[PDB]
Amino acid sequence: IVMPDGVTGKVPSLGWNSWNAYHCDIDESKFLSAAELIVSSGLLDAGYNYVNIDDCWSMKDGRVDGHIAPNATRFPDGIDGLAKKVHALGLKLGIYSTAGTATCAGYPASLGYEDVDAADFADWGVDYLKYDNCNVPSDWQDEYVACNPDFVKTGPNGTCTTALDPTLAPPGYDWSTSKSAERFGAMRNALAKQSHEIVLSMCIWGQADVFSWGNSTGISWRMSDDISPNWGSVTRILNLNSFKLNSVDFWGHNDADMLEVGNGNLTAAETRTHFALWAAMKSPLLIGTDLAQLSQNNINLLKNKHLLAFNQDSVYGQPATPYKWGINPDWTFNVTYPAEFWAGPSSKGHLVLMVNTLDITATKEAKWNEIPGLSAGHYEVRDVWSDKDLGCLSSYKAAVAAHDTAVILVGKKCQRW
Ligand SMILES: *[C@@H]1O[C@H](CO)[C@@H](O[C@@H]2O[C@H](CO)[C@@H](O[C@@H]3O[C@H](CO[C@H]4O[C@H](CO[C@H]5O[C@H](CO)[C@@H](O)[C@H](O)[C@@H]5O)[C@@H](O)[C@H](O[C@H]5O[C@H](CO)[C@@H](O)[C@H](O)[C@@H]5O)[C@@H]4O)[C@@H](O)[C@H](O[C@H]4O[C@H](CO)[C@@H](O)[C@H](O)[C@@H]4O)[C@@H]3O)[C@H](O)[C@H]2NC(C)=O)[C@H](O)[C@H]1NC(C)=O
């Protein structure tokens, strides 16, 4: 959705969220340190300007006088006070609620209280609302389910049918009229009336066919169930998103979930693949790890100027898309072996990404005639990882480590005859 200030949320949000770092165990200091570190590590200069509180910030036992109250032990100066400290640092503050009767962690949530919660958030100086999908009451349940492989039984190729899912929405069903759309729309409407602009991030896990109506409601929408810091989830989410890229443009981006850079058992190669594809798919990019514990190597990864410029491109709204699946036939839904060959235009040139989904070194070749928007010829090519000029190339071939991604920026045409 377009926001009144004409820029906030047009390109993917960039920041840091407490969830993958701390889950439910958060307090002010964790945000103050995250913020100090975003500034001092140069991440803010790179573009990461949201410090986002996720679940577990409020007094858990209920609303206090009709309002969600900050847990004052965790936030001794309140959300408003944190907001002031964060705003002073040149950052933005995100908070979290749920379109249900309690948050996913069981805290007070916003369904039916949108106008009061939106006013509190606005009055606190909150800039971003991640809005979750837990605890939807029976009366607010959707009639149908949408074909979401993360939740519903699928046949081969991630397909849904009536026989597998009796409640699958009939063809032509308008998801904008669903209860999910209403629940989210109600918070959209509530925020819109406040003077302080808050962007809405729709944490709906790819449910309710949010791809078709999300752009009328918020600036981003989760398109899958929660990421986990392993390769299985990286490929799971990559595969799901690869089929949903047509919903991604300015003001409205599929959210491939929070970054796991720094976390779990992802190797350096997997981490690169994960960040590069998240950036290229123009998901919001929300760091999800303790920045004090993050290696300078992962910090440099996050600051990749080319991946960020591409993600943040203000002329080209579409993301990089798969042009060739690779091991499988094009358009093959496959959780372990998603589309390998990706490209999209940008102001800086064409970004090309080649994901080695195999667990052994493989040679991957970017061939210009295969890439939409390119043609046979010679282009200047730059390695995105090293920033190295690779020269004027008729194609680009690399030995790509297991689970790694070769990433190049294809520049202006060169050396003709
Ligand atoms: C496994 O399931 C998958 C997922 O459902 C399914 O995938 C489809 O596969 C078929 C081929 O079998 C694809 O059909 C081809 O489409 C080619 C170009 O399509 C582009 O446009 C597609 C249609 O766009 C419409 O719909 C969208 C939303 O519905 C809407 O936003 C648009 O406005 C428009 O109305 C579009 O779906 C597709 O998007 C997919 O692909 C891009 C990557 O290109 C990706 O980024 C997206 O995320 C999404 O996955 C894309 O935008 C078309 O050129 C091609 O034509 C070939 O054959 C014809 C013969 O007529 C030749 O003329 C031509 O030269 C080509 O050789 C063909 O029609 C279809 O697009 C896939 N759908 C999706 C959603 O991915 C597989 O079929 C399943 N496999 C099995 C075994 O069943």
Ligand SMILES: *[C@@H]1O[C@H](CO)[C@@H](O[C@@H]2O[C@H](CO)[C@@H](O[C@@H]3O[C@H](CO)[C@@H](O)[C@H](O[C@H]4O[C@H](CO)[C@@H](O)[C@H](O)[C@@H]4O)[C@@H]3O)[C@H](O)[C@H]2NC(C)=O)[C@H](O)[C@H]1NC(C)=O
């Ligand atoms: C979600 O909703 C938003 C808001 O309505 C909507 O945003 C719009 O996106 C389009 C498509 O990217 C924007 O229009 C483009 O703007 C860029 C940069 O200014 C231009 O380069 C584009 O022009 C090219 O393409 C045109 C035809 O497609 C050609 O006329 C021209 O020659 C260029 O090649 C293009 O105009 C538009 O500005 C925004 N709207 C706003 C208000 O910002 C978005 O598309 C929605 N998402 C989806 C999936 O529909």
Ligand SMILES: *[C@@H]1O[C@H](CO)[C@@H](O[C@@H]2O[C@H](CO)[C@@H](O)[C@H](O)[C@H]2NC(C)=O)[C@H](O)[C@H]1NC(C)=O
């Ligand atoms: C607010 O947050 C504080 C601090 O995290 C919580 O304090 C804990 O309270 C439980 C029982 O109430 C104890 O078991 C813990 O030892 C306390 N921890 C600390 C460090 O004080 C408190 O529960 C939260 N209150 C609400 C209502 O959300």
Ligand SMILES: *[C@@H]1O[C@H](CO)[C@@H](O[C@@H]2O[C@H](CO)[C@@H](O)[C@H](O)[C@H]2NC(C)=O)[C@H](O)[C@H]1NC(C)=O
């Ligand atoms: C996902 O794609 C992978 C790669 O094509 C498939 O894995 C292959 O499966 C066939 C059948 O078992 C084997 O002959 C190959 O040895 C496998 N290749 C690799 C590299 O593992 C897998 O079958 C696909 N999954 C689904 C559900 O279709």
Ligand SMILES: OC[C@H]1O[C@@H](O)[C@H](O)[C@@H](O)[C@H]1O
């Ligand atoms: O409990 C908080 C969590 O709730 C889940 O529903 C969500 O997908 C996660 O991103 C995290 O927000």
